[PDB]
Amino acid sequence: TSRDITVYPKDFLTYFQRNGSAAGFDYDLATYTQTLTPNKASQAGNVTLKTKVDMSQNFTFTGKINLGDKAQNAGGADGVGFLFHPGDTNVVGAPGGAAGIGGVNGAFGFKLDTYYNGVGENSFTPDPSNFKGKPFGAFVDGLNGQAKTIASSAQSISEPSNNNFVDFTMSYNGATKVMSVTYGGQTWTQDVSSFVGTNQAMSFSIAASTGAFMNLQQLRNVNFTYTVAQGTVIANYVDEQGNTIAQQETTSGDIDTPYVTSQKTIPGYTFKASNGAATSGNYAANDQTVNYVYTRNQGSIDVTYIDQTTGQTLSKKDLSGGTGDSSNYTTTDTIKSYTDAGYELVSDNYPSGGTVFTDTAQHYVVNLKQKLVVSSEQKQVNETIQYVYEDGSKAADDYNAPPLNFTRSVTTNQVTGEKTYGDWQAQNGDSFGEVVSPTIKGETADQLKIDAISGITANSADIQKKVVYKRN
Ligand SMILES: [Ca+2]
């Protein structure tokens, strides 16, 4: 592998970060010594590995640990915890009974517990009963957050004494997933395959803890041959309201080596912004998430109603919605109002079976004309000559003349009420004939004839004449 190095004593601080207690002390570059905790109460100091570890390759950890100058009976505590978890390179475990492993998720490793915790918290299960007041080295199951000691791995160790450094070797087989830890003559072996659940890259922490009891806890001549894990960029494609719209695109690569992400073209959506990490960058030991936000594409549909008689817009409806959704708009309601008001529908290009908003705009038109109802009014001009005696009694039947009929069209607008009259056409003529008055036997008439009356119009008034007959 290319991502595969050996961390030398002289470069300890390059690859390890002094946290809590340890950050008060400078790595002595003559002894190659790093203080985790001093001989003081309520301490908590760790070294977190800056990178991560490929938990599928072969790593060999070498060094000497000073567990202090006091046993538990003599007021000595708490021990040295080795942490392996899949989480952040900066997350470290709870102190005391959790021994630098408990209270992280997906956590496992090896402790030298120089203090027997018999009373269990929510962060650690009681230490094994077969070790009451006795120092021991053990593997721990920290997956469910609660550090549980593997009672199989529980072998006794030499009490902390005179601040003496004992040899420590932790070796791991990638394919077997088997860890071999040797602390000064005692030897441990455990199958961590159960503990590297799926994630071939784990965070590393060496931690130390004091409480009421205390011990100077240090590390010396550290040698860590391992395969540096690869960084992992994650890329999400989501709408504005969180909901994912495209498959998340998890890449992976050597750290400080370019990663590149891609804006996805997404049917029904336009890119808005990239929240989280840069779309272009370099790879990093913790997991960088580039989200891609998209807007739900909205389509436009308008329906214009036009009075063709005025050539002017009656009303316009504007529908906007998501590319694919139904407007649930009908023209019949807005047509009804108009056809009620005395409009006649000319044309409707709006689809009968509803519309669907699309990426491209939709425009529909409804032409209505002011309804025109052609009527026909008829007028008639009449000539009636009555033939009477001086008493007002009838000498003869009234002559009712061939009537002069007139007719004009009357176009009526049902929207305005306006009446468009045509020209008063004459059906029968303009001239009333001459009417010679009857000759009654033994009478003489005041008018012997009624003269022809011409130039009668539809405006002309009915003629009402009267012939009076005198005796002899
Ligand atoms: Ca303990």
Numbering used by the authors: 40 to 511
What does the original paper state about this entry?
We solved it by the molecular replacement method at 2.50-Å resolution. The crystal belonged to space group I222 with two molecules (I and II) per asymmetric unit. Molecule I was modeled with continuous residues from 40–511, whereas only residues 41–417 and 446–465 were modeled in molecule II. Compared with molecule I, molecule II had a more bent structure with a larger angle between domains. YwfG28–511 fragment had an overall elongated shape with an overall diameter of 40 Å and length of 180 Å, comprised 35 β-sheets and 4 α-helices, and was formed by head-to-tail tandem connection of the three domains, Lec, Mbp, and MubR1. Starting from the N-terminus, the first domain (residues 41–268) had a jelly roll–type β-sandwich structure comprising 15 β-strands and 3 short α-helices. One Ca2+ ion was coordinated by Asp152 (Oδ1 and Oδ2) belonging to β7; Tyr154 (O), Asn156 (Oδ1), and Asp166 (Oδ1) located in loop 7–8; and one water molecule. The N-terminal subdomain (Sub-N, residues 337–409) had a structure called a ubiquitin-like β-grasp fold, similar to that found in proteins in the immunoglobulin-binding superfamily, formed from six β-strands (β22–β27) and one α-helix (α4).
Here, we experimentally clarified the structure and function of the lactococcal cell surface protein YwfG. Amino acid sequence analysis using the Phyre2 and Pfam servers indicated that the 120-kDa protein contained a leguminous-type (L-type) lectin domain (Lec), a mucin-binding protein domain (Mbp), and four mucus-binding protein repeats (MubRs), followed by a C-terminal LPXTG motif. Structural analysis revealed that YwfG28–511 is composed of three different domains: Lec, Mbp, and MubR. Lactococcus lactis G50 YwfG has a Lec domain at the tip of an approximately 600–650-Å long column consisting of one Mbp and four MubRs extending from the cell wall, suggesting that the structure is suitable for binding to distant target glycans.
